[PDB]
Amino acid sequence: STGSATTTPIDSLDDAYITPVQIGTPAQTLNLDFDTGSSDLWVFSSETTASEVDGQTIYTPSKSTTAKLLSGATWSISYGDGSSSSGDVYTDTVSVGGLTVTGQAVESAKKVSSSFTEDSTIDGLLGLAFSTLNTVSPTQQKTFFDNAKASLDSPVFTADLGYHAPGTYNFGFIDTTAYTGSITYTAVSTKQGFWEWTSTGYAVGSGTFKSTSIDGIADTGTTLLYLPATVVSAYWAQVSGAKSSSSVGGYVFPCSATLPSFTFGVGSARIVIPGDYIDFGPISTGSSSCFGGIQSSAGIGINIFGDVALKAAFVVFNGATTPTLGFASK
């Protein structure tokens, strides 16, 4: 049992990536935002408050003959976004790229934040962190990956995000076709329930690599790269005009400027993010100030390797008894 699905950016900025998934019988196809930094499969639904859905495709559990209420079961989730979603829970058959999982917990939103209602391209989230983070009560549920593990050829998915371009999520195998050279595997701590690993240093442009341990999370659910204040300061110091703004709330730079690449260390290996991935365009339409894609971690409490860093690598989430994270060049 394997499965490959195409993931597609939702805008030209690559803010997020959507993957079609099949829920119910017969199938209702919803575009979900595959989030390795949460653990809940939640979807807009026939129960979602109708003042909170605006162009999204909804999951109608009443039309699925595989769909069943999980009586008394209930969910509430909060993101680093400040994003909120909550409601009740169904079991149903869920397929991703032809990999089918039956009795998947599908958490139907009665309630959804502004942030979600505002985003018409996202029909919900599919969480791929560890199941301890799942939010459903009184009985915690497991994630789609956990429900597939055993059935999979290898208990593994890869992420291969594209820069201004589609890419692929594979489940059950490693496409030795998709990366260059060697995959470097590095230890994962599951203790907080994240794909949490430790990077071995950084370089800015063609500068000297500084060996320093950076702990953070692989999170395809976050757009930007979030690194400590020290590291992020060295980065933007190399871009004439860049400053941290109170107003806009982050490093900005003049759109006319030239972003140097950013190198992160995975073991003895090195992944360069080309400077182009670090441009997130004008902070407002018409503005000649542009938003940087490396920002300070200081206000989250965690360093996040988000889409900006993962899109530069072919990434393997080895989800074995001893989980590991692989990076390759692509």
Binding site: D15, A16, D33, F34, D35, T36, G37, S38, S39, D40, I77, S78, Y79, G80, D81, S83, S115, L125, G127, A129, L133, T135, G193, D219, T220, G221, T222, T223, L224, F280, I300, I304, G306, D307
Partner: peptide
């Protein structure tokens, strides 16, 4: 931008 659990 989005910042997927807290």
């Amino acid at each position: 931008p989005t910042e997927x659990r807290e």
